[PDB]
Amino acid sequence: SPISPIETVPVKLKPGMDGPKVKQWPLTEEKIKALVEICTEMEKEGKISKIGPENPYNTPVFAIKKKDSTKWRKLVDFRELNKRTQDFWEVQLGIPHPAGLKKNKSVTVLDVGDAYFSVPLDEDFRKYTAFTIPSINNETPGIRYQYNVLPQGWKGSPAIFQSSMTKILEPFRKQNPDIVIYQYMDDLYVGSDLEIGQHRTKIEELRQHLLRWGLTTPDKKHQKEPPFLWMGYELHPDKWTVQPIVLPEKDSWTVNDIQKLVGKLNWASQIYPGIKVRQLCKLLRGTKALTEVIPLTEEAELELAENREILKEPVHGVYYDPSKDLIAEIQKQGQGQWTYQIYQEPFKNLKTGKYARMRGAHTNDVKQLTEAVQKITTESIVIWGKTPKFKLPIQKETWETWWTEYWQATWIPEWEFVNTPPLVKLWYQLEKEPIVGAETFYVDGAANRETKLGKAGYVTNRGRQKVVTLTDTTNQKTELQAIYLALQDSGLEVNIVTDSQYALGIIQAQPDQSESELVNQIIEQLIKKEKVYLAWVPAHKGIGGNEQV
């Protein structure tokens, strides 16, 4: 195949480094013979060139057969060269989402033939791509070659090749603004809203443009027929979707089985609504073997269960219409899990997705929702270069309240309430000012750093009192422990005074779920209660009964 009449990219080794010089390991008679067959051809094509013994450099070569087959293939261990090559620009920095594709009349797939081989290697650099076919044993000086094109396994091949390929289309692009070219690896996705024939036409005018450049594509009939089975998806004309998901019916599950499982699941969730993975995902905690069998839990089998139902039948996603707004709707799925779906027209989803994140130790639904919103938002900028309008399971009055009082700066773009339960709410709120005719627990807690032993009690302004000894805690723990007590012994209207900013901080944030059990109980209290004020003071300072507790 042709070798591109196109400009070369100036490759350079990393600084204070010279080309590789790896001794060639003695090869068998067959291995050498083969390599010799292969090489000559390659050089016959000009993909390679014979060199002298003056050239200091070397990279090792090898030749492996083929399973089933009696065809040899030359391997060129390019490590040291790579370890020594400059670093290049990152090839493609993400990969288009089917959901982001604007629908076209006709889309054709064209795969370049011998991509790397069809393109020039900076003359000044070939010197390093030097390799040596050993002779029959020690004796005899090996045969020497070097590349004229982009070797496979070398650092800049993918980059340079793409660079090139980008430049080769720029022209055809210019005279073809209404034609979309999707450059992916050594593929070419060509879409147009043309009338079949002129499409078949434009494609060839392309193939020609490509051939005039060294680029051998395939003719009609020789080219793929949609559904296009790209990157895990199915690419029909007016829809797309993940590629065929088969969940394994099986007696017993091992670490590897579940992992593979969670994977197809997560993948499947781009477009299948409400696919859950928490229960399953949990079995994976503290993981033992890879083959170690894991007895699904009741919750896990139900997750699996529900998930089977989801996939039984099939969902497809539609394409993008830049002439319409993006609507994104989120819902609370459960135990810290969320799910959303983007659609441009009521219920004809572009894509779906899920959000779980435990951002923090203790957080709440109002925070999680916004964590989701931000997450969703980015996704959109990336996929569409625009943010959606949100439909959220939360009251505007609830939002504004929280946002308002909350310490952190916060912000959601355009949204609207939507009565899709559960609705997001604040589960309790703290008094702005000191409840009157309400007890006054001056709570306290401390732990001995050495004995890891700790006490935790309070002293009310009504003579009531209490202490407690905790086994292996910390101040942190003792301090939450104190406030729990004070809440526990006090009925619908406490006033609590702590010297712990920690607990303060925690509760002030209105948690409604927490990595901690103690913090979890402290929650039950707060909710059940009726009015709660809570203040902080400096300890070691003759503050109230602080000197007391």
Add this chain to the structure above:
Amino acid sequence: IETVPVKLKPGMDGPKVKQWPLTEEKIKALVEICTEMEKEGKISKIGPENPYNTPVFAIKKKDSTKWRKLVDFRELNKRTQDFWEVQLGIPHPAGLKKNKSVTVLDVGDAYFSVPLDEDFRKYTAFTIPSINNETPGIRYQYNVLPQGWKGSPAIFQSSMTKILEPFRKQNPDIVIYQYMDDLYVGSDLEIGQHRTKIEELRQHLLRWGLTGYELHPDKWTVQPIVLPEKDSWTVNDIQKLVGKLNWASQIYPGIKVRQLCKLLRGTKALTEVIPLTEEAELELAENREILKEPVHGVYYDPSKDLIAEIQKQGQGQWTYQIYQEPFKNLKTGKYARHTNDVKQLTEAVQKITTESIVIWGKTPKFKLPIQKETWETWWTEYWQATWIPEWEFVNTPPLVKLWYQ
């Protein structure tokens, strides 16, 4: 013109920074700019042979419909700090902060006359994203001095000194400080007189190419930590009063509360009033009297990063403190405001920076009470300065908020 050679701070090389997803509106906006600059020959497409990257945003700039392109040279600036600061440094006028009026002028355009060191250009590479990775980013690099790169003024210095010479000669009591792309111009003149000297100055600039914003530094009076005044002092209010006071020691020298704290003895209801002793009424005094007057002992160390920390109060109110060493505040203040949390936080950030440049000649490291991700998606919607300070995201401690409220 012969180009001045720029050496990357030894043992380390080019910035290889990731590029944010930009919005379709910003990408087109941006693409136009670059096609233009390209033709004018300030930037040229670059090849895969360049592994470097610098981010690029699109902004607007106070009172303007036209998009401006902003380049985030923060990393490069770090890597080039010897050159631009301890090699080609610009001195900062103490006087500037004492001037009755300081006007800010964009001078950024100046740079494109100048050629960037040919060996350097690769460092200035930047990409122009594509929606849904549809295509490869437009990769470019600099031929001339870039705007946003701290090395630019360092070079252009000499050249700007000539441009300014006569205006300086003729207006001996006007301060001209340049920071990045901006020019700081201060005078204790009458407003219109000041305004005029500026227009006059603008003209001078005009002959050399270079084509405002109004501050009054000297009236940047403190934000004294405020102890309340009141008749009827509850326990609660005192537990509060010591807290603030107590915390204003270990920052404020000669603070006192021994008598105040006295007031508080036994498990007393917070909702209960307690008459005051008129010696504790002194620490209210003595401290309140201190609280207003600046920290004794806190000086600025030119060899020490500045930190600006900001708190959300409520109702468009935000508080901030600049200090080099925690609790040792070089300056506090408050900033109060179609404005959302981010819009405001953004505006404060720029305000604090401007003062910061004006006072110390350097920008503080911001500690932001926001989520990185949120801060990252939005900040560019309200950003207007041609510079970008550094930031870290943080969770304000309950106390810090009121201790400063």
